[PDB]
Calmodulin (Gallus gallus), 151 residues
Amino acid sequence: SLMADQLTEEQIAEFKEAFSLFDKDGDGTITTKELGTVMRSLGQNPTEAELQDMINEVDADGNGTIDFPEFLTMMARKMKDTDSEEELREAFRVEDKDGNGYISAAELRIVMTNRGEKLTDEEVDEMIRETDIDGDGQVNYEEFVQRMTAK
Ligand SMILES: [Ca+2]
Ligand SMILES: [Ca+2]
Ligand SMILES: [Ca+2]
Ligand SMILES: [Ca+2]
């Protein structure tokens, strides 16, 4: 865990602020139900099993609960709500082989061959319009994100 190292005391101060209002019972350590309360306020509904794993990854002391050093590791990994967005940003690169920041019909052809999902020169040009709104034949992060949100 190198998280406190990548931050300043200015930010670590803000993290003990973010720890104190997070810890409802006021014991100075965040349990599964306490995780479950504050994360549920952000539009999430996690089970005791999930919050347990959120602990087990960051729990270098192995007690079954979060302390301040564990939190600088934990909340940093949660600061990306649906962090799989970065995985689809990676998918945007694999789709953009020429690596210019927008997808074309011939670009969907050359990625679908590697995916094992080979689509016709027509079929790929259809996907361009299924995700992109403006009809330029080009798919950038703004219009691309539509198909990733639709699923
Ligand atoms: Ca507590
Ligand atoms: Ca712990
Ligand atoms: Ca491209
Ligand atoms: Ca477009």
The CA atoms of residues 4 and 11 lie 9 Å apart. The chain has eight helices and no strands. Residues 1-79 form one domain.
